[PDB]
Amino acid sequence: AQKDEEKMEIQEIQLKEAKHIAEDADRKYEEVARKLVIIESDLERAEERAELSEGKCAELEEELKTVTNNLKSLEAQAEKYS
C-alpha cells in the first residue's frame, strides 16, 4: 500500500505536468496557424502583383521593339532618298 501511494503521487505530478504542456502547445498551435494564414495571404497578393507586372512589361517590350525596327527602316529609306 505504501508503494502504491508513492506511485499515485508521482503519477499525479506527471499528469499535471503533461496537461499543462499540452495546453501550452495547443495555444501555440493556434497562434502559429493564424500567423501562417496571414503570411500566405500576403504571399499570394505579392505573386499576383508580380505576374501582372511581368505581363505588362513583356507587352511593352514587344511594342518598343516593333516601333524601333520601323524607325530603323524609315531612316534607311531616308538615306536612300538623299
Binding site: 514587344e62 516593333t66 525596327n69 527602316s73 529609306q77
Partner: protein, 375 residues
C-alpha cells in the same frame, strides 16, 4: 444610340471571326473560329461539361480538345460547325438578336457558288435576319484606305487574293487568287522546327506554333545574305518559352517560314510568289492604268503583318517593274482589321442603304438571288 437600326458587320474570315456594329473603328469581338469537341472520357460528375466549346473558350481548354477549323480555304467545309460559330457570335459575343439587324458578310473572290447560296439561306432561315448582303473582301480593304483606285493584296489566313480596281471599276479578268496563306505558313514552320528537335503534332500544338510564328518570324530583305549571316554568327537566335517551360531557340527558321510567300516552291506549290502575282495581275490590266496601280499598291489581311514585308515586296516589284514608274506600297498600321473597317464604312453609307437583299426578295426568287443584281 437609340432609335433607328444599326447594321451588323460580320466578317467570317478563316482563323479569326471579326464582328461589330456598323459605324465604329474596331470590331467589338475578335476570337478564333474553332470548334473543339472533348476527346477524353471524363470522370467528374456534375462538372457541367459541354459537348463543344467554340470561339475563345476553346483556346483555354485546348489541352483536352480537338480543335478543328470549319473554314478550310475561304470555302466552308463543315456547315453545322459554321452555324454554331455564327450562333455564338450573335448571341454571346454581341448579345443582339439577329431578328432586328441587317448583316454584311464577306466572301473571298472566285469562291464556289454553293457556299454563298448556303450562307444566305442559313442567314435567312435559321437566324432570320431582316436583310443580308455579301461583299468581296478586297473592295472593303480598299474602302478603308480611303482610296478609289489601287490593287489590293489581301493575304488572309485562308487564301491570298489580289483584286485590282481602278476609279471604282473592278477588273474581273485580272483577279489572281492563290491558296497560300497563313495556315500553310504555320504548317511549314511546324515542319521545319523538327530540324532542331522540337516536335509539335497535336492539333492543339498548332496553336503554339502559330504563336511562335506571330511573335518571332520576320521577312528578310535579302534571303541569301540572311541565310549566310545566320549560318556564321548567332545574333539572330531568339528564344521563346513554351506554355510549360523548356525554352526553345529559333535560328534561321525565323525568316525561312515567311519566305514561303515569295517562293511557294518551298511547300511544293508551283505558282509564283506574292511578289510576282501582283506584277502579273497588273500586267493583265490595260496599258493606261498601270501607273496608278503601281503607285497605289495596297496591303491588307493578317499575314501581311510580318516585320519587314513592305520593304521586301517593294524591292521585288521595283526589280520587276519598268525603271521609270514609281512603286509605292501602302501598309497602314491597322492592317489586320482593314477589311472590317472598310465593311463598317460601306454599311454606314446612305447610298448603299438600298442594296441590301430584302427578305421578301429572297422569298420570291430563292437563295439564287445573291448572284442576281443584288450581288
Amino acid at each position: 444610340d437609340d432609335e433607328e437600326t444599326t447594321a451588323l458587320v460580320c466578317d467570317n474570315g478563316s482563323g479569326l471571326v471579326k464582328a461589330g456594329f456598323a459605324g465604329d473603328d474596331a470590331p467589338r469581338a475578335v476570337f478564333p473560329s474553332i470548334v473543339g469537341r472533348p476527346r477524353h472520357q471524363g470522370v467528374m460528375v456534375g462538372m457541367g461539361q459541354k459537348d463543344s466549346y467554340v470561339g475563345d473558350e476553346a483556346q483555354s481548354k485546348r489541352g483536352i480538345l480537338t480543335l478543328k477549323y470549319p473554314i478550310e480555304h475561304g470555302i466552308i467545309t463543315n456547315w453545322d460547325d459554321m452555324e454554331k460559330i455564327w450562333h455564338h457570335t450573335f448571341y454571346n459575343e454581341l448579345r443582339v438578336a439577329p431578328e432586328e439587324h441587317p448583316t454584311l458578310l464577306t466572301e473571298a473572290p472566285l469562291n464556289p457558288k454553293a457556299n454563298r447560296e448556303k450562307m444566305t439561306q442559313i442567314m435567312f432561315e435559321t437566324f432570320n435576319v431582316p436583310a443580308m448582303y455579301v461583299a468581296i473582301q478586297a473592295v472593303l480593304s480598299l474602302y478603308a484606305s480611303g482610296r478609289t483606285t489601287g490593287i489590293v493584296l489581301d493575304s488572309g489566313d485562308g487564301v491570298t487574293h489580289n483584286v485590282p480596281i481602278y476609279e471604282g471599276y473592278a477588273l474581273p479578268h485580272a483577279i489572281m487568287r492563290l491558296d497560300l496563306a497563313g495556315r500553310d505558313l504555320t504548317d511549314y514552320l511546324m515542319k521545319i522546327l523538327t530540324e532542331r528537335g522540337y516536335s509539335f503534332v497535336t492539333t492543339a500544338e498548332r496553336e503554339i506554333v502559330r504563336d511562335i510564328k506571330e511573335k518571332l518570324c520576320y521577312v528578310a530583305l535579302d534571303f541569301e545574305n540572311e541565310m549566310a549571316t545566320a549560318a556564321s554568327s548567332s545574333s539572330l537566335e531568339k528564344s521563346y518559352e513554351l506554355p510549360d517551360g523548356q525554352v526553345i531557340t529559333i535560328g534561321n527558321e525565323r525568316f525561312r517560314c515567311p519566305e514561303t510567300l515569295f517562293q511557294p516552291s518551298f511547300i511544293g506549290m508551283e505558282s509564283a510568289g506574292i511578289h510576282e502575282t501582283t506584277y502579273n495581275s497588273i500586267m493583265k490590266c490595260d496599258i493606261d492604268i498601270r501607273k496608278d496601280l503601281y503607285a497605289n499598291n495596297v496591303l491588307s489581311g493578317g499575314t501581311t503583318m510580318y516585320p519587314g514585308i513592305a520593304d521586301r515586296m517593294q524591292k521585288e516589284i521595283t526589280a520587276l517593274a519598268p525603271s521609270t514608274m514609281k512603286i509605292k506600297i501602302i501598309a497602314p498600321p491597322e492592317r489586320k482589321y482593314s477589311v472590317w473597317i472598310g465593311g463598317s464604312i460601306l454599311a454606314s453609307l446612305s447610298t448603299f442603304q438600298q442594296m441590301w437583299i430584302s427578305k421578301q426578295e429572297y422569298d420570291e426568287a430563292g437563295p439564287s438571288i445573291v448572284h442576281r443584281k443584288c450581288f
